Amino acid sequence: YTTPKKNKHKRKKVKLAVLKYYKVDENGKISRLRRECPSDECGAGVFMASHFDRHYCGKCCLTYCFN
Amino acid sequence: MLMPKKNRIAIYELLFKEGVMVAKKDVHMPKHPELADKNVPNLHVMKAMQSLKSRGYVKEQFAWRHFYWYLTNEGIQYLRDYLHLPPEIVPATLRRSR
Amino acid sequence: GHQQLYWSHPRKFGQGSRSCRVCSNRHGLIRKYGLNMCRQCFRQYAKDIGFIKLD
Amino acid sequence: AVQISKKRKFVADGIFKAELNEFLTRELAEDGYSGVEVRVTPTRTEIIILATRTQNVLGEKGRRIRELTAVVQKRFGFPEGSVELYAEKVATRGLCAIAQAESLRYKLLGGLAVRRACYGVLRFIMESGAKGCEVVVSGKLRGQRAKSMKFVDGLMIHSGDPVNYYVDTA
RNA sequence: UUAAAGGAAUUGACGGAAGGGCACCACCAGGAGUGGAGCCUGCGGCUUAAUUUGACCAACACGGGAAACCUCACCCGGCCCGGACACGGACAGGAUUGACAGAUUGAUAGCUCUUUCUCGAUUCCGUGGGUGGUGGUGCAUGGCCGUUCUUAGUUGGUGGAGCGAUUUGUCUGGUUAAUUCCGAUAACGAACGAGACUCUGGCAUGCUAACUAGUUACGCGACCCCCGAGCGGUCGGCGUCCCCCAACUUCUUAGAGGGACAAGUGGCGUUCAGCCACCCGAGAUUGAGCAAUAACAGGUCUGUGAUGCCCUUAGAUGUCCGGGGCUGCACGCGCGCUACACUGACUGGCUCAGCGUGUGCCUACCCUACGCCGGCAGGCGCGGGUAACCCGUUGAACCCCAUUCGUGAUGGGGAUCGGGGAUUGCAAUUAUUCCCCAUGAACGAGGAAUUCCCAGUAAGUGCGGGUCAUAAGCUUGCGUUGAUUAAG
Ligand SMILES: [Mg+2]
Ligand SMILES: [Mg+2]
Ligand SMILES: [Zn+2]
Ligand SMILES: [Zn+2]
């Protein structure tokens, strides 16, 4: 009837309200900033992650070497 | 429930091609036997027809361990719009056998 | 949730996986001849199956 | 594929019979149900309902047979074109016990005096050509404690085998 | 100071009140016991984080409750939403799913956290409202079930008696397992229960019928035989509906019909109901099922999408996962199992069954022949069987025959406990079960008391269904051997 240890909350997401994953110079130029996933489905589609060093494909859970 | 939009059209197209659908009261079944082609658990088959009751569209009775459902005519005119069908397509409810 | 271990304890052999085909209890059920009904209300439908008592 | 033993053949179609009896009870109770009767062939199987009000099981051009064929077909493992339903009127409405058990169900749901409702049905079976009948209505009547009022009329046997076919209970 | 105290009758219940009947859940006469011992299992108590709980003749091997986990309620922790709908908000310039790595955990639970990709109106937030619950309440109920209750009991209609409640019918007697009948009679005519009835068991050398049952005969093969034959003997070896290279139903399995009625004969009895003897005959009462009227504050909401009301509903009594518990032990009680030996235990020979059950829609896994590995449980290869087709002529135990042992807590008894070996399983620890070797405890027939039973019965003795992945000291059935006492 107490619950002292406080199960803290649920998961509320980070809510980052900006895309801007395509920087542009010289008045119009396609330029990636994140790697694409090397899977059989989403070549230059749904991005691969850019961490402080590593890459990670979020949709199908494949990951590139930590380098 | 969580409502994947491919699988709601998958259960509505079966619930509109005939005026029945025959889920069984067990939640831990990964494969509805009559659908059987979009690896649907019948969690969704329950919890879609729950909502179809509460809008007044579907009409339930419960067997030994089975859910049987029927179309009320308000549900039929709802499904001709959400499946985006012309007002000539009707189920096997009205007259396809003689 | 997280479907890997929702229903992961193996319902296989054992009385946590047998159940009544009418009435959905796991206790007392008769798995003889593939009946798989509850003990308490096999007696209801025993004439509907066709099992007469002695007369 | 391979077929199963004769001992569990006979309990499987007996439990087929008991299952759709219970569902067609739950559906057609308000419509005068009074049972079913099954015939299996190596073709289309034919199940005749024994409804007393055969008008109400028929929809506008017979809907509530055709969806009631479909739930029988899409549950009990029949292909498209193997089970059919027919509605048939059972003779002497007030002589089979299931029928007016259900009739006085919806008369007591109608809010009658329980003594008024049971007398109308007691008078009805005994004028329908019966040798004896009795109705027991038991539970929470006017009072906080439950009690049982029975309304026996005529003669009625209780023991032996002839209380298996000379009677029907409900 | 008080709403009754009282009177006469009636119906029930009761009587350490009479009279007449009945019951092995009563006794006699007996048997087997139980009660003492060890063990198995339920209950109480104690203990415990929890040792979940319901029930106290008619609770206590009972919830078909033999729990490793699941079951599962209870305990310690942790995810999930499987919170439908209705309204508003959030809401394309950023509502919501999912997730690699790592401190983060019991956990490869994105549980949370750090970082960052991904999902396409699906949702999320708030408020009403559902919904679920092995949550309460069986004294709010239904249904089922047990019980007074295995005994003969119960009720109208119409007449009669009473102002009336009621009573007669429904009885002096005789008789019956029975208000069963006879008869008597202010009653008459009835109905339910009893009985009949259904299942079962025993008999029909009669009928119908059998390559999924058989017999007999006839062929063939084998083997024995004074001496050496064979219409000799043995053979569950083969064949004879395989397209006649035979007939038949005794045995086996059914189906029909028959048969027993107290019929026949004495004796008793009102020559009534009936009873007691015999003869004939398979049988002169087979065994069980259903089972009334009226009830119980009987049990069950923890069997049920039977259900009222209350409670709880997201830090949820919902549900899932992991661990633990329901098995903890100074003790008390109840069912039972094995024993205390020589009417026995060994070791080996030898011969007899019946009831039944078997591969699954979800559901994974069934019964087992044979062959070959193993000292044993077992392991493989190889078949058959959805069954009068295969296991299976179910070579069951007891018993029978020989051997050893000799009245010694002994080769009786096998508890306890060490070490090893296999199988089931996701997992065997608090030993699942089985196997082997060793250890070798009480126990010498059981006080008061108490149970069940009178014929294939008691008791002995195994077998099979239920539970069952692994499993019966339980239960429900089956056969086997078979009585001692009694007809009150
Ligand atoms: Mg229940
Ligand atoms: Mg001795
Ligand atoms: Zn891809
Ligand atoms: Zn409560």
Swiss-Prot record, chain A:
- Subunit structure of this chain's protein: Part of the 40S ribosomal subunit. Part of the small subunit (SSU) processome, composed of more than 70 proteins and the RNA chaperone small nucleolar RNA (snoRNA) U3.
Function of the protein: Component of the 40S subunit of the ribosome. Part of the small subunit (SSU) processome, first precursor of the small eukaryotic ribosomal subunit. During the assembly of the SSU processome in the nucleolus, many ribosome biogenesis factors, an RNA chaperone and ribosomal proteins associate with the nascent pre-rRNA and work in concert to generate RNA folding, modifications, rearrangements and cleavage as well as targeted degradation of pre-ribosomal RNA by the RNA exosome.
Q: What domain of life?
A: Eukaryota
PTM annotation (N6-acetyllysine): residues: K20, K29
According to its UniProt record, where is this protein located? Cytoplasm; Nucleus, Nucleolus
Stated name of the protein: Small ribosomal subunit protein eS31
Q: Where are the zinc fingers (C4-type)?
A: 37-60
Cross-link Glycyl lysine isopeptide (Lys-Gly) (interchain with G-Cter in ubiquitin) lies at: K23, K29
Which part of the entire sequence is included in the shown chain?
85 to 151 of 156
PTMs per UniProt = Monoubiquitinated at Lys-23 and Lys-29 by RNF25 in response to ribosome collisions (ribosome stalling): ubiquitination promotes subsequent activation of RNF14, leading to EEF1A1 ubiquitination and degradation and rescue of stalled ribosomes. Deubiquitination at Lys-29 by USP16 is required for maturation of the 40S ribosomal complex.
Curated annotation (Swiss-Prot), chain B:
Q: Where in the cell is it found?
A: Cytoplasm; Nucleus, Nucleolus
Name of the molecule in the record: Small ribosomal subunit protein eS10
Mind listing the GO molecular function terms for this protein?
RNA binding; structural constituent of ribosome
Disease cited in the entry: Diamond-Blackfan anemia 9: A form of Diamond-Blackfan anemia, a congenital non-regenerative hypoplastic anemia that usually presents early in infancy. Diamond-Blackfan anemia is characterized by a moderate to severe macrocytic anemia, erythroblastopenia, and an increased risk of malignancy. 30 to 40% of Diamond-Blackfan anemia patients present with short stature and congenital anomalies, the most frequent being craniofacial (Pierre-Robin syndrome and cleft palate), thumb and urogenital anomalies.
One of the protein's GO biological processes: translation
Return the similarity comment. Answer: Belongs to the eukaryotic ribosomal protein eS10 family.
Tell me the part of the parent protein that is shown. 1 to 98 of 165
The scientific name of the source species is Homo sapiens
Q: What's the subunit arrangement here? A: Component of the small ribosomal subunit. The methylated form interacts with NPM1.
From Swiss-Prot, chain C:
Which parts of the sequence bind Zn(2+)? C20, C23, C38, C41
Q: Which domain of life is it from?
A: Eukaryota
Q: What is a single molecular function from GO for this protein?
A: structural constituent of ribosome
Q: Name one Pfam family in it.
A: Ribosomal_S14
Known outcome of mutating I30F: In DBA13; results in reduced protein expression; results in pre-rRNA processing defect
Co-factor(s)? Zn(2+)
The record, for InterPro entries, names: Ribosomal_uS14 (IPR001209), Ribosomal_uS14_CS (IPR018271), RIbosomal_uS14_euk_arc (IPR039744), Ribosomal_uS14_sf (IPR043140)
PROSITE patterns found in the cross-reference section: RIBOSOMAL_S14
Q: How is the cofactor bound?
A: Binds 1 zinc ion per subunit.
State what changing I49T does: In DBA13; results in reduced protein expression; results in pre-rRNA processing defect
Q: Which UniProt keywords apply?
A: Acetylation, Cytoplasm, Diamond-Blackfan anemia, Disease variant, Endoplasmic reticulum, Metal-binding, Methylation, Phosphoprotein, Ribonucleoprotein, Ribosomal protein, Zinc
- Where is the protein found, in the record's own terms? Cytoplasm, Cytosol; Cytoplasm; Rough endoplasmic reticulum
Residues bearing PTM Phosphoserine: S8
Name a GO CC annotation attached to this entry.
small ribosomal subunit
Sequence positions bearing N6-acetyllysine = K47
Main location per the UniProt record? cytoplasm
Which residues are recorded as modified (Omega-N-methylarginine)?
R11
Q: Which GO terms describe its biological process?
A: cytoplasmic translation; translation
Q: Which disease is it linked to?
A: Diamond-Blackfan anemia 13: A form of Diamond-Blackfan anemia, a congenital non-regenerative hypoplastic anemia that usually presents early in infancy. Diamond-Blackfan anemia is characterized by a moderate to severe macrocytic anemia, erythroblastopenia, and an increased risk of malignancy. 30 to 40% of Diamond-Blackfan anemia patients present with short stature and congenital anomalies, the most frequent being craniofacial (Pierre-Robin syndrome and cleft palate), thumb and urogenital anomalies.
The gene coding this protein: RPS29
Swiss-Prot record, chain D:
GO molecular function ontology, one term from the record: tubulin binding
The biological process GO terms on file are: apoptotic process; base-excision repair; cell division; cellular response to hydrogen peroxide; cellular response to reactive oxygen species; cellular response to tumor necrosis factor; chromosome segregation; cytoplasmic translation
Which residues are annotated with the PTM Phosphothreonine? Answer: T41, T69
pH dependence of this protein's activity: Optimum pH is between 8.0 and 9.0 with activity decreasing sharply below 8.0.
Carrying Phosphoserine, the residues are S5, S34, S103
Compartment(s) of residence? Cytoplasm; Nucleus; Nucleus, Nucleolus; Mitochondrion inner membrane
**Impact reported for S34A:** No effect on phosphorylation by PRKCD
Mechanisms controlling activity: Endonuclease activity is inhibited by MgCl2 on apurinic/apyrimidinic DNA but not on UV-irradiated DNA.
Write down the membrane topology: Peripheral membrane protein
Where on the chain is N-acetylalanine found, per UniProt? A1
Assembly, in brief, is: Component of the 40S small ribosomal subunit. Identified in a IGF2BP1-dependent mRNP granule complex containing untranslated mRNAs. Interacts with HNRPD. Interacts with PRMT1; the interaction methylates RPS3. Interacts with SUMO1; the interaction sumoylates RPS3. Interacts with UBC9. Interacts with CDK1; the interaction phosphorylates RPS3. Interacts with PRKCD; the interaction phosphorylates RPS3. Interacts with PKB/AKT; the interaction phosphorylates RPS3.
Q: What is this protein called?
A: Small ribosomal subunit protein uS3
| Gene that specifies this protein | RPS3
Included stretch of the parent chain: 2 to 171 of 243
